[PDB]
Amino acid sequence: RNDWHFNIGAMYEIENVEGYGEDMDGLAEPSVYFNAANGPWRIALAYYQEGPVDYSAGKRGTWFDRPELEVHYQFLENDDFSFGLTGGFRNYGYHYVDEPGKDTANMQRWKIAPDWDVKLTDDLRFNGWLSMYKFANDLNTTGYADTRVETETGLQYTFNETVALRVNYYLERGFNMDDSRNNGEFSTQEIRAYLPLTLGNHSVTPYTRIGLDRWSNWDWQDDIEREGADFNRVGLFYGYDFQNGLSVSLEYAFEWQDADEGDSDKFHYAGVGVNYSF
Ligand SMILES: CCCCCCCCO[C@@H]1O[C@H](CO)[C@@H](O)[C@H](O)[C@H]1O
Ligand SMILES: CCCCCCCCO[C@@H]1O[C@H](CO)[C@@H](O)[C@H](O)[C@H]1O
Ligand SMILES: CCCCCCCCO[C@@H]1O[C@H](CO)[C@@H](O)[C@H](O)[C@H]1O
Ligand SMILES: CCCCCCCCO[C@@H]1O[C@H](CO)[C@@H](O)[C@H](O)[C@H]1O
Ligand SMILES: CCCCCCCCO[C@@H]1O[C@H](CO)[C@@H](O)[C@H](O)[C@H]1O
Ligand SMILES: CCCCCCCCO[C@@H]1O[C@H](CO)[C@@H](O)[C@H](O)[C@H]1O
Ligand SMILES: CCCCCCCCO[C@@H]1O[C@H](CO)[C@@H](O)[C@H](O)[C@H]1O
Ligand SMILES: CCCCCCCCO[C@H]1O[C@@H](CO)[C@H](O)[C@@H](O)[C@@H]1O
Ligand SMILES: CCCCCCCCO[C@H]1O[C@@H](CO)[C@H](O)[C@@H](O)[C@@H]1O
Fold it and tell me: What InterPro entries does its record include?
């Protein structure tokens, strides 16, 4: 038997829509997590919430919580190949306020996800993860498709110790395996690019996501909706490592619709995180 490694941490993320010259409504997304690792094994517990930012200070709407348990096993880990596998369980416990005909819901998500890292040359790596999810229970309420596939995979070129370029293909696709179901169906494809910099104890990663294509059909999106015009997004992740097990992270991203017309809604994403490693 080997050593236990532990992490605990907490994050607070905000999403805002910008329209008519100001922040128009936003979500607040507190979360916390704990993880424990030994040899090839890792287990992670987490609790996440998403609801209206000023929900407790007066009023607002639909929120959900999302307790989670994941287990990861590293099959291979070396220089030339790494391969690992996650199994996961979440509950989505929805509380509807906005919604007519809707009340509470509990829908589970089951996850199986390989992750890999393959050396192509001394400078170049092919890496990625791919996840399959099954959603179960309350789907008539939540409107989700029963199955989903998601992957980010691509190439990493390392310049030297301080800088690396990564460029990835991203896909997310919701579909129904049950012929009877037709809700929640969508597809999103992007290219994503990152320039992670390691400057002493600071980590700085500017990045961009370039929309390739997206569509959602009838059910999906905003109940009474479902769209299909693609977004660009630019962001910056900043990390700081205190060298005593403590680290903090700050993230900011801006997203707009390259679509044509007059104006259209934009989106801001911000996050602050803390991790303690022992
Ligand atoms: C801080 C800068 C404020 C500039 C104000 C311009 C933003 C207007 O964004 C608004 O998005 C709406 C959603 O479709 C459009 O319908 C409005 O016509 C548009 O003005
Ligand atoms: C679980 C991790 C801790 C997160 C709590 C950090 C403090 C959150 O603070 C919240 O900020 C909101 C705006 O974002 C305000 O609307 C709320 O009134 C305020 O409680
Ligand atoms: C880091 C460790 C996180 C564990 C937190 C577990 C919290 C489980 O709390 C869950 O909250 C939901 C509220 O909608 C309910 O639907 C569930 O019945 C309830 O068990
Ligand atoms: C800079 C942020 C890049 C996000 C890339 C998404 C794909 C992640 O891919 C991951 O790369 C890791 C190397 O860092 C490997 O350890 C993992 O096995 C691999 O799944
Ligand atoms: C570093 C070794 C594990 C890499 C992560 C593989 C697990 C895939 O998990 C994925 O994590 C993503 C963030 O990467 C989330 O965006 C995805 O929704 C989640 O499915
Ligand atoms: C390092 C380079 C990263 C960026 C690659 C972007 C490739 C964009 O690709 C294009 O994107 C458009 C999105 O509206 C589509 O309409 C085009 O048909 C699609 O081919
Ligand atoms: C730090 C440099 C990144 C700048 C990104 C923020 C500026 C994006 O601004 C966006 O530009 C788009 C393209 O012209 C317009 O369609 C959007 O209306 C506008 O909000
Ligand atoms: C998501 C996590 C899935 C775990 C998949 C199986 C991992 C454990 O299985 C592994 O460990 C031993 C049994 O303990 C076997 O003898 C090994 O050969 C096997 O690789
Ligand atoms: C991602 C790291 C830096 C991102 C900075 C983006 C902040 C842009 O924010 C602003 O950009 C304008 C374009 O000038 C938009 O039209 C404004 O409405 C928006 O608030």
Answer: Bact_OM_Channel_sf, Outer_membrane_porin_G
- Phi-psi category of residue 137: left, alpha or beta, with phi > 0 → left and psi -120 to 50 → alpha: left
Say which residues have a Cβ less than 8 Å from residue 66's Cβ, sequence separation at least 6: 47, 48, 49, 50, 90, 91, 92, 93
3-state secondary structure of 236: strand
Residue pointed to by tokens 């409107």: 143
Per the entry, the structure determination technique was X-ray
Three-state SS at 2: coil
Nearest CA to ligand 9 atom 7: 254
> What is the distance between the alpha carbons of residues 223 and 230, in angstroms, rounded to a whole number?
19
Which residues fall within 8 angstroms of residue 134, CB to CB, at 6 or more apart?
109, 110, 146, 147
The owner of tokens 């896909």 is 171
What's the rounded Cα separation, in Å, for the pair 125 and 182? Answer: 39
| Structural domain total, the chain | 1
What is the rounded CA–CA span in Å between residue 204 and residue 19? 29
Q: How many CB atoms lie within 10 A of CB 220?
A: 19
CATH code for the domain of 213: 2.40.160.40
Residue 57 Cα to ligand 2 middle (Å): 11
Residue 6: C-alpha distances to residues 196, 232, 246, 247 (Å) = 24, 36, 12, 14
Q: Name the residue of 168, 170, 210 whose CB sits within 8 Å of the most ligand 6 atoms, as the mutation to test its pocket.
A: 210
Data resolution in angstroms: 2.2
The residue segments making up the domain with residue 229 are 1-278
How buried is residue 125: exposed, middle or buried, by Cβ count under 10 Å (0-12/13-18/19+)? buried
- 105, 124, 107, 128: which is closest to 116 by C-alpha? 128
Q: How far apart, in Å, do the first and last CA atoms of the chain sit?
A: 18
Is 73 close to ligand 8, i.e. is its CB under 6 Å away? yes
